[PDB]
Every structure is written in structure tokens, then in C-alpha cells.
From a paper:
Caudovirales, the taxonomic order for the tailed double-stranded DNA bacteriophages, is characterized by the presence of a tail—a host cell attachment organelle that is connected to the genome-containing spherical or elongated capsid via a neck. We describe cryo-EM structures of the neck, the neck-capsid and neck-tail junctions, and capsid of the Agrobacterium phage Milano. The tail to capsid junction involves a symmetry mismatch that is bridged by the neck, and is therefore crucial for the assembly of tailed phage. The extensive network of disulfide bonds within and between neck, collar, capsid and tail provides an exceptional structural stability to Milano.
A 3-fold symmetrized map focused at the neck-tail junction was used to understand the interactions between the collar and the tail. Namely, the head-proximal end of the collar interacts with the β-sandwich domain of neck 1 (gp14), while the tail-proximal end of the collar interacts with the tail sheath (gp20). The interaction of the C15-symmetric collar with the C6-symmetric tail sheath is more complex. Five collar subunits (e.g., n, n + 1, n + 2, n + 3, n + 4) comprising the asymmetric unit interact with four tail sheath subunits belonging to the two topmost sheath rings (or layers) that we named Fn, Fn+1, Sn, Sn+1, where F and S denote first and second ring, respectively. The collar subunits n (Cys19), n + 3 (Cys19), and n + 4 (Cys23) form disulfide bonds with tail sheath subunits Sn (Cys467), Sn+1 (Cys467) and Fn+1 (Cys244), respectively, thus linking the collar to the tail sheath by nine (three in each of the three asymmetric units) disulfide bonds. Additionally, the Milano collar connects the sheath to the diaphragm-like structure formed by the neck 1 lumen protrusion loop, allowing for the sheath contraction signal to reach to the genome directly, instead of indirectly through the neck proteins, in preparation for genome release during the attachment to the host cell.
Numbering used by the authors:
A (entry chain s): 379 to 498
B (entry chain q): 442 to 498
C (entry chain p): 4 to 89, 201 to 347, 363 to 498
D (entry chain q): 253 to 348, 360 to 378
E (entry chain Aa), F (entry chain AV), G (entry chain Ae), H (entry chain Ad): 3 to 130
I (entry chain F): 1 to 12, 18 to 230
J (entry chain G): 1 to 230
Amino acid sequence: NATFRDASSRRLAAATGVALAEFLQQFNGLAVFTKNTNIRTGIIGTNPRLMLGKIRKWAQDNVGTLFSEFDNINEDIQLLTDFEVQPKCVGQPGIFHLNMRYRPPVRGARINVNMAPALF
Amino acid sequence: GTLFSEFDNINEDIQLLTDFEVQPKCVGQPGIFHLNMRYRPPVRGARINVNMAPALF
Amino acid sequence: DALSDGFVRLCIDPSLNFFGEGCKILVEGQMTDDGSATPDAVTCVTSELDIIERFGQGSVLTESLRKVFCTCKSGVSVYALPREDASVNPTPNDYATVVNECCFAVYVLSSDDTDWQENLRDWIRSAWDCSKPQCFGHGYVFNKGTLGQVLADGDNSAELSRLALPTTYPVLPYLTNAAYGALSACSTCNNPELNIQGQTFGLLSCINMPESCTPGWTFGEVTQLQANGFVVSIYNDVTNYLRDEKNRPNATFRDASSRRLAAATGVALAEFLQQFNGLAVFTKNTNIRTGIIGTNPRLMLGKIRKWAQDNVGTLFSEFDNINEDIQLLTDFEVQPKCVGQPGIFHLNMRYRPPVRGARINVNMAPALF
Amino acid sequence: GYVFNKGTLGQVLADGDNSAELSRLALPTTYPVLPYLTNAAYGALSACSTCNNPELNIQGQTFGLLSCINMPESCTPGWTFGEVTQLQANGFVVSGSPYIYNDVTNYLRDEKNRP
Amino acid sequence: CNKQNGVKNILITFTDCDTQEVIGPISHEQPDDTLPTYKNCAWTNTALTNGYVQRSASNATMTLPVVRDLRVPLAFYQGCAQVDVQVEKFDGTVMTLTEGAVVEPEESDGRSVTMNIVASEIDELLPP
Amino acid sequence: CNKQNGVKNILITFTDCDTQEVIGPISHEQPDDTLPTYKNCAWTNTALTNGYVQRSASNATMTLPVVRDLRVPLAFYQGCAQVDVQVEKFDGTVMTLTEGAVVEPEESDGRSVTMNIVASEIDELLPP
Amino acid sequence: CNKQNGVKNILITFTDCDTQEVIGPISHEQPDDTLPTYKNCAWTNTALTNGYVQRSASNATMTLPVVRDLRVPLAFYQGCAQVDVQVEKFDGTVMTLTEGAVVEPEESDGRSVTMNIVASEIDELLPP
Amino acid sequence: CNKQNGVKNILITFTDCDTQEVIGPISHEQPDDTLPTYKNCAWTNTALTNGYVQRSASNATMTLPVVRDLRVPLAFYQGCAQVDVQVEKFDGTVMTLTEGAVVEPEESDGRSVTMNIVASEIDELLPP
Amino acid sequence: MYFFSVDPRNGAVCGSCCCESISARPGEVNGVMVSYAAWSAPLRGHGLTNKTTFEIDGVSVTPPKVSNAFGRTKVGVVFEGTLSDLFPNPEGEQVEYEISELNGPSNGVVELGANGAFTYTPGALFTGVDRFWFSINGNIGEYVISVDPTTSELPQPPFTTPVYVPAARRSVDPRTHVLKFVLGVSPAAIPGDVYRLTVRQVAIDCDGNEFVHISCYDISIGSCG
Amino acid sequence: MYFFSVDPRNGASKSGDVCGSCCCESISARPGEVNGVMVSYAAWSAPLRGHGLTNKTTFEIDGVSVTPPKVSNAFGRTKVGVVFEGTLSDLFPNPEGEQVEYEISELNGPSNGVVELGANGAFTYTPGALFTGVDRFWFSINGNIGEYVISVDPTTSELPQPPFTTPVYVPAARRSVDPRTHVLKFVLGVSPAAIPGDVYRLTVRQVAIDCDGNEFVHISCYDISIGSCG
């Protein structure tokens, strides 16, 4: 489980954590309609899918800088709303549960030459 | 949408409870048409608690 | 650090888990008392950390679940029934008490004793009975011995996939068995249509058998095993059926794919019919009023047919004579009316596994010019 | 209405009823500012902002940063995470310059059905 | 024989594609003597030259007039909800249409609507 | 049951779109036996192929014949005045409409007009 | 519900490339029955001889007709501000485009604009 | 039925030529009444003078409209994935094509795309 | 009044195993009717008989905290008793007692003293059994007193079980195949508990033979209705 | 009540022979129940224009899955009026005496007497005064159910022997045949000692009669499935 072996891995982990935070600061008290998902003309808001979209977009964008080339992205990103992961009648309106992988990028090592001075 | 959230059952919250029947023709005073409406402010954003799971290939 | 506010709440944990487990394979095998755990008690084991001092170091169960814990990386909910020890083979086991309604899809029994295998068979077939509570389980067992013995040491059970092995097989038998089951589960527990054969979809990862020239069952023996039953390796992931009530040819219940898809149709129709609860079903005037939610037996049959005409191709195949394959008879209809009671109905369908590909005989004949 | 309440958890936690008409800014016993100033600032900013548009949640750093407080930068807060999390269930207006967040009122319960 | 033509039962199930609510199956009553009209073959044909024909893909349509039930909103008949309809004639024939959609709504006065339903396929039972 | 079809009350409010002066709400009387028609769903459908359908946006319409009130100019019925209409049937139903706009004016004779109101949405109150 | 080809939500976020001000995300409404059209592949192809093809670099395009919101200036639609657009269909698909730029603006009347947006890449979500 | 012209089966196999992953063969459905068009001879001719002709090398061409399958991304239709296609008509003919490349991608709306496949050679199977 | 229908035994709510469901509130005494019409009508005979048998089993009991106590006083004479040696009050807790007026005595009056003392004055000219229900710090128990007609004594009755079916209040209607019986719930039943009632009803044919039938119902002691 | 329609033995088949048949009709039973079964030979005996059925039916009980019982049964004897004492500990051959809880379920208690269970595998059976016959009661040692019969003579010598009722049985004489409608009625009693999950097979051989007194034999089978809660 060398996932946290490289120091650089942990450092960039913290970095991408705070970056993901500053990205998901725009989704503040900005309204979210989770029962009709039909935003009326003029209103300013979103809904679970319209936010999952933006999250995946940000993920794709940052690939190469912090993340590596993602695996099947439809698995990594998930934006389960509050009353979908909680005891039925408990979930407070307006909470989400986003959860994501990283797969940090790859770098260079392990050069195993097999030189052969063989003759002519 | 802007002033409040979607009514779950609009034919229950709204109620125009009047009293006109009581008012007899032997007097003119109108105007008791009280109205009682429910309220659920538009839902907003709150804790979006995230759970990242680093890994490798 | 831009996280003080309280809006985002992040937990950077490497060993997270999101999957919806499902896929509830059970492993059964004798143990050594080193394992600090109550025997005869189903234990939904976690990954390795809670090991040999949970089931018994060294004993068959250790290696079995190690292979199982191996193979599939993610997708299953492993369950263990650590039976205890005592021409010895302490197998006695009529234990529908310890293992009960909590239902398991895949079963693997690491014991060549016919009795234990037959008991597991009986339990599965009981689960697979017309009894309204259903879960549709399937087992996997191994069987070594010579050709004569392997043939003799068998049955009609189609709820297992008894694995054949020659008396030369290097690897300890039960090992492979476990792996087999493991792979199947973790592979098919979402898509039932898949069939575990060939090389790409079915090669056992954790085996590493020593290569040789003399394989094992020669071609003739291979045909014997295949036709008769057993799943000689992998290839031919059928379930030994070979027969039926009276007439032998019953191609339908041959492939394991057929069985998994049949279980899928069963659970789908079960979870579908429940929209006919309440409802109110008129059966004398056959004339629902105006403004009352209700249905008529004919209407119900129509609904059922419509349903069975959408899943076709994906679950069923073609439904040759739809007018006869799907029949719904009310209690009063069949029974001459003395012992009739509104509420009871009889539905009977005709399962036909979607035809799959098979051998393609080639007859290339060269010539010149 | 906007008002403050200062002291130690116990008191501040027990110096507030289900009164929904007031926002009770909670202040630690070591709060190194004059309560009056901060309370006035909070109320004033809320008022000035919500004249044309009421929906705006005055919270977080960006909009809710009490401008004229110039608190002396330090390295230890008053209410720690625990006692905060505590009186966030209990409605209060905890302030961390210092910015405001969880701009709620001291409203927790209708006639008896608390939630 | 050919028992007298006519409808006997009309079951309709409404499903709103916004709130995911379900209503029904509610029965309805014919408003007049006109009968619901059907078309099962999901392939139209077009006349080419010399006996040939161009067979392309199409829908299964349905025309159904019913008196509005005073509990279901009128909008649910003008194409604001997915309908699941079932008819049964007197001679035993029963026709089922699932997850259909009201296409090209017409003006209605509030007591008798005429739905033009379109769906992928309609099933017939052919009484024994 | 289903008490007799027919209209009981018709209320109309005129607002001139130039001087913003409001008149009403005034009542009116049906000129004949016919009834107003309706369409509530703001999304018409179009028959695609193989059962599918294209759901586009559209307008809720309403066609209503009334007798001209001899104190309101005829121009206010011909589409020179924003109208708000309300209809109430015998069975208890009521249909309200706000910020309507008389579209496609039809030549009238001065005592009986047929207004084709178009509005964003018509609201019901299905009887108790 | 399934089988309904149409748009449900259109979000647009304007950012002025002069004052760095942000406006949105504001919802919009379709002006007619035409749908926004898309092209995701950022590589155009050209037909060479004998089955080959010259794969060159290109952009991700988008064509979007919307009703101008009477609060955002018209200039923001005619290619004077960076736009961030996000659409959702009825079948669950949602397409996101960030930091787009309106190319080749067309004449408008003030109530219905047709934006030809060009961007680096568009992502799809492929409903489950 | 030995006469009816039209398409009966359409199979498509996608292979994205970066990750080298294959999807299919997946079936498809025609979006309208129109039929795919073909051109098999990879040698176009150009009219010289006096009865002669210049015979140059070119591509086997194919034009095919289909409904996008909601499990394959739209990019795979816009030309970011090599395609292998097969069409089978009612009269028994089949046209297969391997290692195709979508050239000149056309703007689509997300449910009905028109692919211009170009390949080295198309094969027939003239009905017996 | 609960109303259940029996399965007519054709292999034609399984819940967990088979047994039906019955909600119940502590203190109530309700009535249940079960219609064997579906099972006994095809067997054309003489209907049911008055040979039902009931059995109560608890699958969730929550063993009681407080305990009960007996009493054998005489007629007309006052009785004194304590209420402190009942609750074992394991962890230091106020021993605040209470006598609910809903479940007080039946032919007397108690006088709750300051510290778990009570004075029971039986009704003049009365000899028999009496009960009352106390609540020691939320947990409810019963105290039974036997007032004796001054001759020698009076026997000991059994402390009532949380869920019970009265001794003789059952009936059968052979003209409609309906069994009526009563469900009594003690006020000491702890909410959340679940008991199981099993019934074995016998029908009879025109010759005097028997037809057995067995069923269950799961009684869920729930609070607040 | 179960009602079955017999096969006609003529040309085509019936009841799901679509893909063959389990070959036996099914009968769900619960330990302790005594139900009634009717079989209608109208499909087979009506074309045989004659005198219908006769009272010459014969049955056979065979177990295909038994799961032999844990606790054995026992037999007792006593004179009239004199109280009987007995033990309940030597009937449970066990690998451990862990917490053996001798229990007498009231639903299947005695019939003409009363039983007082002791503390440890003892019991006192007081037969009813002025009574002589056979009396049984079903005990449950650690969940495992068995029966104890204490048949009482009138102190003459003894009753010979009760037959130790089987898990599933058909009473000796409670069957009948109606030659007017071609229906055979018989009762099916299953003891409370049947184990859930067992499977027995009951085969019925019924003979009709022509107009002159000859015979037409017919044979059928039924699989009895003992399931608790049913």
C-alpha cells in the first residue's frame, strides 16, 4: 500500500484537498433544487446532477497537474445527496456526500539496462 | 421558487378561512377573510462533507 | 486554511470503501482450533487482517479463503462457516439453523465427502423450491478420482458445479475449487448473462500449476466429463444435469448462465408483481366501476404478457407461442366452484435461456489455382 | 434583532431561549474586544447588505467579514471546535477582521416538537 | 356469433415525470358511442413503383376519448404525465399500452378529453 | 354523480397595456350553449419514431366566448388590452388565468366575441 | 421519464473579460422547439485517398438558442464576455462547457439569441 | 418479404484508438424513414473529352444516420473512435465495413447523428 | 377491533416466518376476530367448536427492572406497606415513587407516604383480590393485595403477565365461522417488546371428527398508540 | 382444503407438462395440522360411462427426505385411577447435557388427564377419574419434539399397544367416494413431530368400475412438504 510512501504524494494530497475545497466553495448557500430538478427561468441554482457535472469537469481539467489520467470516471466521482445515504427520515435538506479517488501521477525510475558488449 | 419552496400539498397549506355566513344582512361590516399559509424557505447549500480516497495504479 | 469556515469537511483516508457489497459467497471447511472464533457460526469476515486466528491456521479453510480473498479484488461480501473437526472426514452437517434466511449467492465446500456435498445440495434445492421466500443460491464443489469413480460419484443436481480432477492433479483440489467460485461470483454478481469459460473470462489467476506435457484427462475423458457433467479445466462452465424428471434431454438447465438468468427473472418478476397489491380485483361481474382503482383477471394477464414482452431477448429469448407459454388461471376457473376463494391465482410461464454461441465446425479444404 | 451574549459555554449555552426574533452572537470569556463593537458591526453589515435583496446569507469570509474590528492577530481562539460544534446545534452566531459564519437565529423548537 | 362491439373497461395509470408520483390504475367511462381506435404494426409502408414498398420504422398509436375524472388534474390528460392505458372490449379482446405519452394535445372543455397516445408497442390478447 | 356540465361564473379584468389602467373584475354571460376550452400543459409533444417523443416548450391556451359588455370598448376584447380571466363550472371546478394576451383576433359583430387567450400557465382547483 | 428528447435546464454564467465581474449561474429558457446541438470530438477528419484520413486538431463546438434574460446586457451574448454553459436533457444527459467564447455573432432582435460557442473540450455524463 | 425495401439490422463496433478498448458489436435503430447510402467502387472517374475518362483512386464511402445509444458517449460518433459497421436490409443483402473513420463530423443534437464513414472497401453479400 | 382472515390451506403476509402482526399499547384491552370462513366452509360440516388453545411466547422481553409483591390482609383492617425494597436502584438515583390514578386500586384507596410508604384501606364489606400499578422512577410494577374474610385466609393468584388472553372470553360463531377473543396488555409491558401468540383451532365434520389449524400473531407493544 | 383434478390418461396431458412435471402434485403441510383432500376423477371416470368409483382405495406413505429425529419416543402403562410417574431424561441421547429444558407445549398436551412437569426430566401424569383408554402428550427436549403415550387400562390386564403415530399419516377410516360426482375425500394428519424441510410421498391407487362389475385401476402420487409456518 505504498499509496502514502512518497512524501510528495502526501504533500500534493494536501494540496489537491485544499484546492478541491476552494473549488467547492462556489456551491455555497446558492440554492439547490433536489425534488423537482426544474430550475425556473430567472432563478439561480443547481441540482445533484448539474453539480456532479461541474465536479467531473474540474477533475478532467486538473488532470496532468495534480491528478493522473483517471480510470472509469463514472466510478470515481459520486455525489450522493443527503437523504440517500442516511436513515430514511433523518437527512437534513441541503447536505451532500461527494467522494473521489486521486491516482497521483507517475514519474521516472527503475531503469534496468542490460548492456551487451558482444562482438562482431 | 424565489420567495419560498415548492408546496408539498398546495390544497392544504393555503386556506382562506372566512366568516361571511355569520355576518347577517342587518349590518354591513365586511372584511374578515383571514388567510393562513405555511412556510418553508428555499433550501440552500450547507455542509458538503467530502471523502477523498487516494490510491495508485 | 480555507477549510476553517465549516462548509467542506474532508477525510483523506486511503482505505475507504464505497461499493454496495452484495455478492455474498459462503465458504465451508474444517478448521484447526488455533482460530479464535466460535465454530458453527456464519462470520462475515473482513479482508486479511482478521485471519488465521479467526478460522484456523493451516487448515483447508485458511488456503481456501486465501485463494478466495485473492482472486476477486473487490465486489463480494465474503462469508465463512468454520465447521469443526472431530476415512475420518468429520462432515456431519444438517445445519439449516446456523445458516438460515440470510441468503448467500455462491457456495464453496472444501470437502470431497459425498455426504457433505449432498447435504449442501439438499439445502440449496430447498432454497430453490416453490416456497414464496426465495433467494436463489448456487454452490460449487470439487470431485477427484478416476474416470469411473468421477462418473459414479455424481448425481443429477443442477444446483452445484461439481469440479472433476484426475488423480495426478498437482495442486491440492479444494484450492482451485474456491478460486473458481470466487471468480464467478465477483464477475457475474451484477451481469448474470456472462458465462465463465474460454481463457479471458475464466482463467484462474491464483493457481500457478507446474507445466508439463501429459495434461490429465485425455480427449476421450474430456468428452466423457463434459457431456456427463463436470467442469473439467477452465472450460465448459455447465452444471451437471444430463437428465430431467423422466426424459433425459433438458438442454435448458445446462449452462450456469441459464441458471443465473433464471434467478434474475425470478427476482425481477417477484419485485414487479408487488404493484398488484391492494388494487382490488373484480372477478364476478368483470366490470370495474367508474372512479375506483381496480383490475380484472384478464387485465392482469394482459399486464403480465406486456411485461414478458419487454424483457424478451435480454432475459427470455423469443416466447414461441405467447398465447400458451404465459397462462394465468384464477382459483375459481380451474376448481369447480365449491372450494373457490377470491384472491388466489396461478401463473405459469416458460423459461427459455437466450441461445448462446457454441462450437463452429470448420472444414477448410485447400487446393491450387 | 441582533444582540450579543458573552461568557463561558455554560452561561452562553444556557443564556438563550427559543426566541426566534434575536440573533445572539456568542462571545468567549477571553474575547479580547468590547462586545458592543462587534455586535453593532454585525447588525450594521447585515442591515446594509439586505436592503435590496434579503436572500443573501451573510456568512463565511467573503460576505460577512466584519471590516472595522481590526482584532489583534493571535494564535488561539476562544470557543474551540468542540464547544463550537456544541452551540451550532444550539442556535448561535459564532465568530472566528474576524469573519462571521452560521448566521442563524436562536430558534430551535416550535411549540413542543423540537426538530 | 361475434358478440356486440363496444368497450367495457378503460383503465388509465398516470405518472408524473417531474415529481415521480403515480396515480391509478383508475377506471374511466366512455363519453359517447365512439370507440378507441388502434394501430399495432410499428412499421409504416410507402407505395413505390411496380409492387415494391419502402418499409420504415414508426410508432404504435392510439386514440381514446374519456370523461375526465374529477380527482385527476386536467393537465394530466393534455400531456403532462406518462400514461399506462388498458382497454377491454365485450368480445374479450384486451389491449395494453405501457409508458405511452400524449402527443399533440387538443383543446378540451373540462369533462371529455380525447387523448392521442403514442407508444412503442401495443399487445393484443385475442380472446380464446 | 357528476352534476351537469356547464359554466356558472365568468370574471374578466382588463388592463390597458399603454396607460396601465385597470377595469374589473367584471362578470359576463355565455352567448350560447357551448363552453370554453382549455389546454394546461405548457409542453406539447411531437410524434418521433419508434415510440420516442420530442418534448418542447409551448403556451397554455384558452378559448372563451362571451357577450360584449356595453361599458367596455370592443378594442379591449380584440387584443388591445391585457386580460385576466376566471371560469367556474357547476361541478365546483375553477380555472384562473393571469397576464393573458388575446392572440389572433377574429372579426366580431359587436355583441358576441370569441377570445383566444394565451397565458403562461392556467391553474385549477379541482372541486373538493 | 425515459424516451423524451428535449432540454430541461440551461445554466449560463457570464464573466466579463474587462472588469473580471461574474454573473450567474442564471437559468434560461428555449425560444422554440430547436434543441442545442453539440460536437465533442476535438479532432476533425479529412478524406484522403484509399481509406486513409488526415487527423488534425480542432475545437469543440456548441450551438445554443436561448431567450435573452432582461437583466443581462445583450452584449454578453454577442461575444463580449466569457461564458460557462451547462445543459441537461430529459433523459438524464448533462453537458458542461467552461470558459467558452462566442464566435461569429449573428444579428438579433433583442429577445432570442443564437450563440455559436467554441471551447477546448465538452464533457458528457451518460445517465446511469 | 422479398419486396419491401428498407434496413433491418444495424451493428456497430467502437474501438477508441488511444486506449485500444473495444465496445460492441451494439445494435442500433434508424431515426427516420431515410436509408443509408453507399459507394463501393474505390475508383472515381472523371470525364475527359471525346469519350475517354481519367480513373483515379478514392475511398469507399458510406452515409448512415442512427439514434445515439445512451451507453456510448457522443464523441465516439463524432469521430474520436474507429468504427466497424454492418447493415442488413430486408431483401437479404448485407454490407460490412471494417476499420472505418468518421470524416467531416456534423453537428448533432445528442439523439440522432449522421455518420460519414470512409473505408478502403465495402463488402456485399448479394442475397443468394 | 382487529379482524384477520385465515389462509384456506391450498398452498396458494409471510413477514418473517408466517405469523401476522398486531400492534398494542400498554394498558389497553382490545378485541380480535378471526374468520375461519375461508378454511372451514369448503369442509362442509358443523362449523367450528369451542376448543381453542392459546399460547404466549416472547421473542423480545426486556427483563423488568422493578419487581412485584403480594399481600394477605384481612377485611376492614387497614394495611401498611413499603415500596423501597422493590426497586434495586443499582446506580445512585432518586427513588421518586408515584401511583398512577389511571391504574389505582379497585375497592380501596392508597396513601403514598413520603418515602415509598403506602397505606391501603380496603373498602368496607369487601373480601377478595385487588391490584394497583406503581411507577418507581419511570419503571412500572404492580402490587397485589388479598383481603381475607376474617375466617382464615385467601389463595394466591398469579401475577398477571405483560400480554395475556382472558380465561373465558372466547366465542365461536358456527353460522359464520368467526372466532372472537380478547387481548389484554398489562401496564407493565415495556414498549418495544415483541411477543408471539399461537392459536390451534379445531373444526368438526358431520360425523364428529376433527380438523386442526395453527396460526400465529406477533404482538408489538408500542408506546403512543 | 386441497382439491386436485386427476389426469385423464387420454392423449394430451395437463398441468404444466409444458416442460414436463415434477410428476407429483404438491401438498404443503405444517406439523400438527389435520387437513382434508379431495380428488376429482371426473376427468378420467366420466368418459368411462359406468358406475363411477368404488370404496376400494389404498394408500402408501414413503419418505424421500426424513432427517431422522433426535429425541426418541417412549411408552408408558398404568392402571385406572392410579397416578403415573415418569422420566424424561433417558429419551435424549446427546453429546452434551448442556442446558436440557424439558418443556410440555400446551397446544399438544394431554387429552383426558393432566401433567405436572418436574424440575429435572420428571413428570407426574394424573389420568382423568373414571377413564380408560389411550392418552398421549408431546414433549420438547431442547427444541427436539417427541411424544409420550401413557395408555391406561381399566385395571383388567392391559391395552396391547398403540402404534406410535408416524410424522405423516392418513387416518384408517375417514375416506369416502361419491359415485354421483366422481370425488374421493380423505383426511391428511401430520404429527407435530415432523421436521421442517422433510419430504414424503403418498401414492393413491383408486379403482373405478364399469357397468358390469369389472375394474379400471388408476395410480397417482403427491409430494408432502413439511414446512413450519404454513
